[PDB]
Amino acid sequence: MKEFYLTVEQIGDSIFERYIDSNGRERTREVEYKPSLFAHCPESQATKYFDIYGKPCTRKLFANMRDASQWIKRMEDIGLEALGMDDFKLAYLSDTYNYEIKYDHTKIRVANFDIEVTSPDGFPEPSQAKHPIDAITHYDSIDDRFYVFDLLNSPYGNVEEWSIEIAAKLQEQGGDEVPSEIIDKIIYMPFDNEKELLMEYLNFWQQKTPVILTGWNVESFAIPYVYNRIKNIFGESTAKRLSPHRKTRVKVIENMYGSREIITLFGISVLDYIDLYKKFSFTNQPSYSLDYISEFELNVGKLKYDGPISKLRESNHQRYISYNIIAVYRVLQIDAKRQFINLSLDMGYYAKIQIQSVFSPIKTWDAIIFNSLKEQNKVIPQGRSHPVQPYPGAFVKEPIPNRYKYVMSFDLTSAYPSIIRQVNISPETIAGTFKVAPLHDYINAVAERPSDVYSCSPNGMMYYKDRDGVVPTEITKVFNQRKEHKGYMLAAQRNGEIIKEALHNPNLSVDEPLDVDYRFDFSDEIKEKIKKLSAKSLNEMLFRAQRTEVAGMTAQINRKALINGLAGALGNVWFRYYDLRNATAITTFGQMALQWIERKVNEYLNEVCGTEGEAFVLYGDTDSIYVSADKIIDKVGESKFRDTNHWVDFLDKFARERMEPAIDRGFREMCEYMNNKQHLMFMDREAIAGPPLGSKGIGGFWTGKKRYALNVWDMEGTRYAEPKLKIMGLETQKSSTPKAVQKALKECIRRMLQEGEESLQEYFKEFEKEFRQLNYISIASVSSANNIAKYDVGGFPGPKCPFHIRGILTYNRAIKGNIDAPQVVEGEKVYVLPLREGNPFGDKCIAWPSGTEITDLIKDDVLHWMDYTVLLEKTFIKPLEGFTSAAKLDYEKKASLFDMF
DNA sequence: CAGTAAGCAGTCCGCG
DNA sequence: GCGGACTGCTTAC
Ligand SMILES: Nc1ncnc2c1ncn2[C@H]1C[C@H](O)[C@@H](COP(=O)(O)OP(=O)(O)OP(=O)(O)O)O1
Ligand SMILES: [Ca+2]
Ligand SMILES: [Ca+2]
Ligand SMILES: [Ca+2]
Ligand SMILES: [Ca+2]
Ligand SMILES: [Ca+2]
């Protein structure tokens, strides 16, 4: 097999590399890597190295990495550019793996661990590590085993051994329901004392040294806790054994407010699953507890126990251990679904970076572009300092707030990356500037043609047409990967809808789910067999289809994020190729394209309908248009349609056979006008939206920019078994809106769009009458809580104190002098409730940590004083009034003359 | 981390 | 009470 790196570090003048050799064995080597850097030189001097602009360079080979770093400094002191890859491990990987990396995940040791620490005096701070580690569960991907290290004797209580037999039993038998599929994979090790536990853990770690290290909050909790506890008991040298090269750094994490402490283990790649989830999941969650995320992702019940966690070990050690094991398994289950570890490996190996660098698109792109340029003996420019400067972004059309009955949407495939490729936007392809006219002159095709030689953006930039830039070249490769995975995602989705249909008529049989590849559209033979399956087999197939769809989503959406991050990186002062000329070339071309095509679509539709001046495009955002199809439907007449699916077909055909050719023609003209390198503006139909045939549903509505709802029948070629709501921006979509409120508002919207005014009034009336019964958590608002200290003035709200911070301060007073009460953590999320006048908390709201029950001390008082009226008005009624006035509907029946009888 | 646009909640305060 | 300036937070792209 081909070799691949596992980890790489620079330590002084050595590269330390862990790798898989040609026999699939793990090895470690220390290499005294001699880096090269580059300086411009005279033309008269023969060389094969040129910078990205074609100026000749001489290579400088250094005796060692420190000489190279010192040289960079002296070049700054002289005032001359020091060219080449200044991150020497990236140069090392590029030299050592000068081919596309084919990796084998089965040879990569992925460790997933979690620790428990009993603490009587509040949260056990990792930087102090003053309490014994009383349990570790460490799952090893190569052994496929959960290694359980269990402390039997502690100053906080001596306990009996954990029982695997009780662990396996149902909770209704008194057991812990540790899933049966892992029972045989548990290797249980009890210990008489913490020192032997930790010594054995370190010996185990030595034998099975993680390459990828993950778990839930491991970076901010488990790793620094284990490190510091070992440090405190044994000394530094012993704690450094967590690093295969015995090197660690205490690293400070700083954004804007405050700072925390993480331990960098040299030669390990830490991918904390919480950070993987935040970067790659594209959710915003009200809470990031593992119980909360597990429930959301896996539909598994909360891990339940009596009393506080600080008393759980002594009261029920059996359950204490079982829950530590389950917690480790839950992260593996989330990963089997979401496949974020697989994604990280793919992207890391593609770029040739440290795997943990996948969190940084700047570092990812820096390395991809470096490897690409190196191939052609080209030399990358030195990174420079730039002051942060604002620059313009997308255009968003102001919609007329209204109901909109029939709507078809279109938007550009991979808009920004496509602009980059079409225009040929790249550091080395800048050809010059032209004299710019106001944007509107380009939109209306009245401005002078920018160039007869170069490819242009309406921001005034011109680009070469003779050859692709490195940015277009590399962005295209990742775009193509994205496209392949999106294809699989969409096929899985369509296949899902086939199964849902079939589920209307399940067969009364005992049979099995078909063995099929859900990434490909089901053949006719598969469809026929599906129509004969039991409900059990169909449901199993649906679950499997949806799992495939999720896997495709992870792979495609994060590749989309990476390429979109390249368009962004051009406006990031930290990027090697930062250039506001290029960042603005992209955004300004986008504004033009949207408004250009708005004009073209309006002109086309006024033509087919025989009108003038009428606005068919009602909305657009960045690269999308929403076209009113009322007139199209009305031209055949609603009476002509057999059912909903019939008009959906008709509009689908109209979009494909009339709209898209017209759109393509308009964009080809724009490409010619801008003299671009390649026409790549592909604006495909997204949504077909409307009310159910013969209903009083309104179909859709807009309240304003980035705020709308549509009843959709077909999304990007997926024809739904049941209509789906596309809601953007409205409160149903915000993590800040109470759970129960999101649900009620969504049902109100469903009724509006599918059923009409009267249905809406029925549901509102019922919701208003019943809502006081809803669980307090389900009706609590949610907010991130930053700068708690800034607004805290002796425990009371300072000037301009935000509502949610006020709540926290209320909470802090209510729990003051309580060591065991959960503390609100700076920068984390809180639930927030309003309080009625004259409550014992002495303020108008309270907040507590999100994803948790409020502490029992005050729970009963919060419940007694919760202001249901304020809650209702602010979270439900106010947004609903916004929706209904926009749609010209009433959520309460108005008096009519019929009332006289 | 460190792409921009733009919505709504809330504070503070004006607005005769 | 609304709205304007402002802070805070959260989406849509
Ligand atoms: N998360 C993001 N980061 C940076 N730029 C973004 C992000 N989301 C959207 N954009 C910018 C770049 C996109 O090309 C453009 C249009 O957004 P959008 O339609 O969501 O994606 P897209 O056009 O790149 O992919 P798709 O093919 O799925 O439509 O807006
Ligand atoms: Ca725990
Ligand atoms: Ca798009
Ligand atoms: Ca599309
Ligand atoms: Ca059937
Ligand atoms: Ca779009």
CA–CA separation, A99 and A714 (whole Å):
43
What kind and span of H or E run contains A138? Answer: strand A133-140
Q: Is the Cβ atom of A415 under 6 angstroms away from ligand 1?
A: yes
Q: Is the Cβ atom of A568 under 6 angstroms away from ligand 1?
A: yes
Q: Is the Cβ atom of A272 under 6 angstroms away from ligand 1?
A: no
Q: Is the Cβ atom of A416 under 6 angstroms away from ligand 1?
A: yes
Through-space separation of residue A392 CA and nucleotide B4 C1' in angstroms: 7
Separation of CA A500 from chain center: 28
Phi, psi (5° rounding) for residue A739?
Answer: -50, -50
What kind and span of H or E run contains A5? Answer: strand A4-11
- Per-domain boundaries in chain A: 1-108+340-382, 109-339, 383-468+573-729, 469-572, 730-774+867-889, 775-866
Residue A92's nearest CA partner among A154, A13, A24, A163 is A13
Contact residues for A796 (Cβ-Cβ < 8 A; gap 6+): A809
Separation of CA A580 from chain center: 26
CA–centroid distance, residue A687 to ligand 3 (Å)? 12
Separation of CA A484 from chain center: 20
Architecture of the domain delimited by A469-572: Orthogonal Bundle (1.10)
User: Which nt sits closest to A791, CA to C1'?
Assistant: C7
Instruction: Please tell me the total number of residues recorded for chain A in this structure.
Output: 901
Enumerate long-range contacts of A519-524, CB under 8 Å, 24 or more apart: A519/A488, A519/A491, A519/A492, A519/A548, A519/A552, A520/A488, A520/A491, A521/A491, A521/A494, A521/A495, A522/A495, A522/A498
Experimental structure resolution, Å: 2.0
Q: Which amino acid is at A194?
A: E
User: Residue A30 is encoded by which pair of tokens?
Assistant: 């220390």
Contact residues for A421 (Cβ-Cβ < 8 A; gap 6+): A472, A475, A476, A479, A677, A678, A680
**Residue A643: Cβ-neighbour burial (10 angstroms; 0-12, 13-18, 19+):** exposed
- Covered bases, chain C (protein CB within 7 Å): 7-13
Q: Is the Cβ atom of A622 under 6 angstroms away from ligand 1?
A: yes
User: Residue A669 is encoded by which pair of tokens?
Assistant: 């003209």
Dihedral of the CA atoms A576, A579, A582, A588 (nearest 10)? 130
Give the CA angle between residues A16, A22, A27 to the nearest 5°: 30
Residue A665's nearest CA partner among A607, A609, A717, A715 is A607
CA–CA separation, A294 and A114 (whole Å):
15
- The position carrying tokens 């993680």 is A210
Contact residues for A404 (Cβ-Cβ < 8 A; gap 6+): A618, A626, A628, A699, A700, A701, A702
Ligand at shortest distance from the CA of A717: 4
CA–centroid distance, residue A595 to ligand 3 (Å)? 15
- Please, what's the b/e burial string for A138-169 (b: 16 or more CB within 10 A of its CB; e: otherwise)? bbbbeeebbbbbbbbbbebeebeebbbeebbe
Through-space separation of residue A799 CA and nucleotide B13 C1' in angstroms: 13
Query: Is the minimum distance from the CB of A800 to strand C below 7 Å?
Result: yes
Q: Are strands A145-151 and A212-214 parallel, antiparallel or unpaired?
A: unpaired
Residues near chain B strand, CB within 7 A: A 253, 255-256, 359-363, 390-396, 398, 568-569, 571-572, 574, 587, 703-707, 729, 799-803, 806, 874, 878-879, 882
Q: Is the dihedral of CA A508, A509, A510, A513 positive or negative?
A: negative
User: Which nt sits closest to A800, CA to C1'?
Assistant: B11
SS (H, E, C) A486-527: HHHHHHHHHHHHHHHHHCCCCCCCCCCCCCCCCCCCCCHHHH
Cα–Cα distance list, A282 to A257, A300, A340, A492, A594 (Å): 24, 21, 12, 19, 25
Cα–Cα distance list, A673 to A364, A461, A502, A601, A667 (Å): 35, 14, 51, 18, 10
What does the DSSP 8-state code read for residue A107? G
Q: Around Cβ A266, how many Cβ atoms within 10 Å? A: 18
CA–CA separation, A233 and A193 (whole Å):
12
Q: Which amino acid is at A204?
A: F
Under 8 Å between Cβ of A373 and A125: no
Query: Is the minimum distance from the CB of A281 to strand C below 7 Å?
Result: no
Q: Is the Cβ atom of A489 under 6 angstroms away from ligand 1?
A: no
CA–CA separation, A655 and A179 (whole Å):
50
**Residue A526: Cβ-neighbour burial (10 angstroms; 0-12, 13-18, 19+):** middle
Nearest atom within ligand 1 for CA of residue A563:
24
What does the DSSP 8-state code read for residue A773? G
Nearest atom within ligand 1 for CA of residue A417:
14
Through-space separation of residue A399 CA and nucleotide B11 C1' in angstroms: 30
Architecture of the domain delimited by A730-774+867-889: Up-down Bundle (1.20)
Q: Is the Cβ atom of A623 under 6 angstroms away from ligand 1?
A: yes
Query: In sequence order, what are the beta bridge partners of A264?
Result: A249
Ligand 1 atom 24, closest CA:
A414
A559, HSE (Cβ side, Cα atoms, 13 Å):
26
CA–CA separation, A703 and A687 (whole Å):
19
Collapsed DSSP state (helix, strand, coil) of residue A752: helix
Contact residues for A317 (Cβ-Cβ < 8 A; gap 6+): A159, A160, A162
Residue A433's nearest CA partner among A410, A404, A454, A402 is A454
Through-space separation of residue A867 CA and nucleotide C2 C1' in angstroms: 25
CA–CA separation, A419 and A587 (whole Å):
9
Phi, psi (5° rounding) for residue A271?
Answer: -120, 90
Query: Is the minimum distance from the CB of A729 to strand C below 7 Å?
Result: yes
Through-space separation of residue A231 CA and nucleotide B13 C1' in angstroms: 56
Report the Cα–Cα distance between both ends of chain A, in Å, rounded. 88
Query: Is the minimum distance from the CB of A409 to strand C below 7 Å?
Result: no
Q: Which amino acid is at A314?
A: E
Phi, psi (5° rounding) for residue A85?
Answer: -75, 110
- The position carrying tokens 């017209």 is A662
CA–CA separation, A688 and A408 (whole Å):
5
Residue A482's nearest CA partner among A395, A382, A579, A555 is A555
Architecture of the domain delimited by A109-339: 2-Layer Sandwich (3.30)
Q: Around Cβ A99, how many Cβ atoms within 10 Å? A: 7
User: Residue A891 is encoded by which pair of tokens?
Assistant: 């959520």
Under 8 Å between Cβ of A568 and A491: no
Collapsed DSSP state (helix, strand, coil) of residue A214: strand
Ligand at shortest distance from the CA of A483: 1
CA–CA separation, A331 and A348 (whole Å):
21
Phi, psi (5° rounding) for residue A408?
Answer: -120, 130
CA–CA separation, A572 and A580 (whole Å):
9
Ligand at shortest distance from the CA of A531: 5
> What fold characterizes domain A775-866?
Ribonuclease H-like motif (3.40.1820)
Collapsed DSSP state (helix, strand, coil) of residue A428: helix
Under 8 Å between Cβ of A774 and A784: no
Under 8 Å between Cβ of A140 and A147: yes
CA–CA separation, A585 and A255 (whole Å):
29
CA–CA separation, A149 and A470 (whole Å):
51
- Covered bases, chain B (protein CB within 7 Å): 1-12
Q: Could you give the angle at which helices A470-502 and A415-423 cross, rounded to 10 degrees? A: 150
Contact residues for A403 (Cβ-Cβ < 8 A; gap 6+): A698, A699, A700, A701, A886, A887, A888, A889
Ligand 1 atom 5, closest CA:
A564
CA–CA separation, A470 and A370 (whole Å):
10
The CATH number of the domain covering residues in A383-468+573-729: 3.90.1600.10
Collapsed DSSP state (helix, strand, coil) of residue A171: helix
Ligand 1 atom 17, closest CA:
A415
CA–CA separation, A309 and A303 (whole Å):
12
Under 8 Å between Cβ of A261 and A277: no
What kind and span of H or E run contains A842? Answer: none
Architecture of the domain delimited by A1-108+340-382: 2-Layer Sandwich (3.30)
Contact residues for A425 (Cβ-Cβ < 8 A; gap 6+): A419, A457, A461, A463, A469, A471, A472, A570, A582, A585, A586
User: Which nt sits closest to A829, CA to C1'?
Assistant: C9
What does the DSSP 8-state code read for residue A622? S
Ligand 1 pocket check: which of A563, A622, A684, A716 to mutate, most ligand atoms within 8 Å of Cβ? A622
- Dmax over Cα atoms in chain A, in whole Å? 104
Cα–Cα distance list, A186 to A137, A139, A178, A202, A654 (Å): 9, 9, 10, 19, 60
